[PDB]
């Protein structure tokens, strides 16, 4: 299962 | 800034004349990801070639497997034609049964 967030860089 | 593809052309199983197999063209170690890959039969582009989903190695370079079903013979010539931003012209790598 993937990590639930990608935080804007 | 850019990395040129490594190209290997080979079969899934050891080649046997008149026996169905898969012709593979593995392109790897390239960057950026856009790449054009064709499998050729006597210099002619083969249709319905499939490919793996885009992924990459620990050094960030990309890799893809292009493949198609084929029945090798003693006379038919197979090859892989690759173009990338790093190449002045498409690179053609011939299939060799012992490679």
């Amino acid at each position: 299962l993937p990590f639930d967030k990608a935080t804007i860089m | 800034i850019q990395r040129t593809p490594k190209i290997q052309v080979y079969s899934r199983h050891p080649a046997e004349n008149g026996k169905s197999n898969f012709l593979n063209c593995y392109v790897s170690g390239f960057h950026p990801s856009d790449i054009e890959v064709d499998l050729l039969k006597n210099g002619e582009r083969i249709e319905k070639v499939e490919h793996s989903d885009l992924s990459f190695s620990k050094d960030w370079s990309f890799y893809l497997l292009y493949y198609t079903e084929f029945t090798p013979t003693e006379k038919d010539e197979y090859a892989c034609r690759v173009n990338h931003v790093t190449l002045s012209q498409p690179k053609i790598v011939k299939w060799d049964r012992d490679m």
Binding site: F3 | I1, F56
Partner: protein
């Protein structure tokens, strides 16, 4: 033995050719099991291994929500990194991310990973402590401040020590017949004269899983690292891998050369010679 889970993301801008493409693939060891592509006719998380198919609609919908949100976040990140490097709006750029967890042979967390790159160069990485960052340059230091503000490292540590290991162990059980099966290499040595005084010895390894293998040539029991032509390990297309190692040897000295094969699937390592 040891196992890992990894997700690989590729976000690629393409000025004048629409919005950036976002690709996500998931692996357990050398087995891909999911894909998401923002360019697909109907973008959704799709299975790529038979053992993941049993996951329910809630699993597929959860994955698709995450990847659809990442598609948007990475479009913003590409815009930002373009600005950080004062780059023109004309060129195509790529952000890559690779993250996941490694288990030891006892199934316990060995270590976690979270790494990002920009145009194929390291950009920012989560340190092994899962608490601090290594920023490659002053651009990556801006991302590092944003990620500290959103408490990204703490959220990643909770995931890597938690959901990552739990789901990896679930997949290893559901796919145990393939994921926990090491297929040994089928090996042979070929001989081809290159001239009257020299011949090529090629040591083949076929049909093995996982991809990790050691193929070496020795001359009189001495490693021939410099004189060996080693091809990159390559996929067969049926889950297995292939590799070969070749040495050009003087005619009549073939028996002084030995090929050595190390792989997880072998009852014992191999020493092979050319068998005329």
């Amino acid at each position: 033995g040891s196992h890992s889970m990894r997700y690989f993301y590729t976000a690629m801008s393409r000025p004048g050719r629409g919005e950036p493409r976002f690709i996500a693939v998931g692996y357990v060891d050398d087995t891909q099991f999911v894909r998401f592509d923002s360019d697909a006719a109907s973008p959704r998380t799709e299975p790529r291994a038979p053992w993941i198919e049993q996951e329910g609609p809630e699993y597929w919908d959860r994955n698709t929500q995450i990847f659809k949100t990442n598609t948007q976040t990475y479009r913003e990140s590409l815009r930002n990194l373009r600005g950080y490097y004062n780059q023109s709006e004309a060129g195509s750029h790529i952000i890559q991310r690779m993250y996941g967890c490694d288990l030891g042979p006892d199934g316990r967390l060995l270590r976690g990973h979270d790494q990002s790159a920009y145009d194929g160069k390291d950009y920012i990485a989560l340190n092994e402590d899962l608490s601090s960052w290594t920023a490659a340059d002053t651009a990556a230091q801006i991302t590092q401040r944003k990620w500290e503000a959103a408490r990204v490292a703490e959220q990643l540590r909770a995931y890597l020590e938690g959901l990552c290991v739990e789901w990896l162990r679930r997949y290893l059980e559901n796919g145990k017949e393939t994921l926990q099966r090491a297929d040994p290499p089928k090996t042979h040595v070929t001989h081809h004269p290159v001239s009257d005084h020299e011949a090529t010895l090629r040591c083949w390894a076929l049909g093995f899983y996982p991809a990790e293998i050691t193929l070496t040539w020795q001359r009189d029991g001495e490693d021939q690292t410099q004189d060996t032509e080693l091809v990159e390990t390559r996929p067969a297309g049926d889950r297995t891998f292939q590799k070969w190692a070749a040495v050009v040897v003087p005619s009549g000295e073939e028996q002084r050369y030995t090929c050595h094969v190390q792989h997880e699937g072998l009852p014992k390592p191999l020493t092979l010679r050319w068998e005329p």
